Motif scaffolding. Structure first.
Motif, mmCIF file in Angstrom:
data_model
loop_
_atom_site.group_PDB
_atom_site.id
_atom_site.type_symbol
_atom_site.label_atom_id
_atom_site.label_comp_id
_atom_site.label_asym_id
_atom_site.label_seq_id
_atom_site.Cartn_x
_atom_site.Cartn_y
_atom_site.Cartn_z
ATOM 1 N N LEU A 75 -6.504 -11.086 5.698
ATOM 2 C CA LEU A 75 -6.876 -9.969 4.817
ATOM 3 C C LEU A 75 -8.387 -10.017 4.542
ATOM 4 O O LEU A 75 -8.884 -11.066 4.133
ATOM 5 C CB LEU A 75 -5.960 -10.074 3.574
ATOM 6 N N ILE A 76 -9.118 -8.914 4.771
ATOM 7 C CA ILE A 76 -10.529 -8.758 4.391
ATOM 8 C C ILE A 76 -10.670 -7.734 3.266
ATOM 9 O O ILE A 76 -9.985 -6.710 3.268
ATOM 10 C CB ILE A 76 -11.464 -8.447 5.591
ATOM 11 N N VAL A 82 -7.628 -4.747 6.628
ATOM 12 C CA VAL A 82 -8.822 -4.319 5.883
ATOM 13 C C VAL A 82 -8.413 -3.649 4.571
ATOM 14 O O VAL A 82 -7.604 -2.722 4.577
ATOM 15 C CB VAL A 82 -9.665 -3.325 6.715
ATOM 16 N N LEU A 138 -17.034 -5.276 10.596
ATOM 17 C CA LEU A 138 -16.008 -6.059 9.867
ATOM 18 C C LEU A 138 -14.584 -5.654 10.243
ATOM 19 O O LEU A 138 -13.716 -6.492 10.480
ATOM 20 C CB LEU A 138 -16.219 -5.973 8.347
ATOM 21 N N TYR A 162 -10.177 -18.905 1.321
ATOM 22 C CA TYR A 162 -11.004 -17.701 1.354
ATOM 23 C C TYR A 162 -12.404 -17.939 1.958
ATOM 24 O O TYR A 162 -12.794 -19.070 2.241
ATOM 25 C CB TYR A 162 -11.115 -17.175 -0.087
ATOM 26 N N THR A 194 -5.401 -8.975 11.397
ATOM 27 C CA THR A 194 -5.822 -8.940 9.994
ATOM 28 C C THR A 194 -5.665 -7.527 9.391
ATOM 29 O O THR A 194 -5.550 -6.541 10.119
ATOM 30 C CB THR A 194 -7.298 -9.395 10.015
ATOM 31 N N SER A 237 -15.809 -16.404 10.063
ATOM 32 C CA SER A 237 -14.409 -16.731 9.764
ATOM 33 C C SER A 237 -13.401 -15.768 10.411
ATOM 34 O O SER A 237 -12.306 -16.192 10.773
ATOM 35 C CB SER A 237 -14.198 -16.730 8.246
ATOM 36 N N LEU A 238 -13.761 -14.491 10.584
ATOM 37 C CA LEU A 238 -12.962 -13.501 11.306
ATOM 38 C C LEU A 238 -13.063 -13.701 12.824
ATOM 39 O O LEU A 238 -12.049 -13.622 13.516
ATOM 40 C CB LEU A 238 -13.397 -12.070 10.945
ATOM 41 N N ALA A 270 -11.544 -7.568 11.923
ATOM 42 C CA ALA A 270 -10.214 -7.353 11.353
ATOM 43 C C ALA A 270 -9.196 -6.711 12.329
ATOM 44 O O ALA A 270 -7.999 -6.757 12.063
ATOM 45 C CB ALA A 270 -10.361 -6.500 10.100
ATOM 46 N N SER A 300 -12.847 -12.481 2.484
ATOM 47 C CA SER A 300 -11.681 -12.527 3.363
ATOM 48 C C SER A 300 -10.813 -13.737 3.034
ATOM 49 O O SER A 300 -11.323 -14.748 2.553
ATOM 50 C CB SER A 300 -12.111 -12.512 4.830
ATOM 51 N N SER A 314 -7.988 -15.421 10.147
ATOM 52 C CA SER A 314 -7.923 -14.598 8.931
ATOM 53 C C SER A 314 -6.615 -13.801 8.826
ATOM 54 O O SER A 314 -5.845 -13.708 9.786
ATOM 55 C CB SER A 314 -9.121 -13.648 8.902
ATOM 56 N N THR A 353 -17.720 -14.168 6.262
ATOM 57 C CA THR A 353 -16.582 -13.412 6.790
ATOM 58 C C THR A 353 -16.729 -13.249 8.301
ATOM 59 O O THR A 353 -15.900 -13.819 8.995
ATOM 60 C CB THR A 353 -16.257 -12.136 5.995
#
Length: 104
Positions: free
Chosen positions: A40-41, A66, A55, A22, A64, A32-33, A59, A90, A38, A29
């Motif tokens: 799941l956020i 959201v 974000l 995580y 990913t 990391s995104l 995503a 995330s 990733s 986030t």
């Protein structure tokens, strides 16, 4: 956030965080995104339209999902870090429970 499931996402995400990969807090986030890997956020923080949209853009760039948990207070802080209130999270490898394939 399905109406009753503010406990379920908390419990299941902490149950994942027990051994899954995580990240926590906006910059964390975003980094990391932008690193793509990733899946799941979560947004459980007082996040306005442009801020969520960024974000949500990462995503979309990363392949990913959201999940809005935007209770306007701190409700996911419970699961993640207990001390800070900004529940923006995330998950990258849920190598524990199925969250990124069931909370999908």
């Amino acid at each position: 956030a399905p109406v009753k499931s503010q406990e379920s996402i908390n419990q299941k995400l902490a149950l994942v965080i027990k051994s899954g990969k995580y990240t926590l807090g906006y910059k964390s986030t975003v980094k990391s995104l932008r690193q793509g890997k990733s899946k799941l956020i979560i947004i459980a923080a007082n996040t306005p339209v442009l801020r969520k949209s960024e974000l949500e853009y990462y995503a979309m760039l990363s392949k990913t999902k959201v999940y809005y948990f935007q209770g306007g207070n701190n409700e996911l802080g419970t699961a993640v870090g207990k001390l800070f209130r900004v529940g923006v999270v995330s998950i990258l490898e849920a190598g524990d429970s199925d969250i990124l394939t069931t909370l999908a």
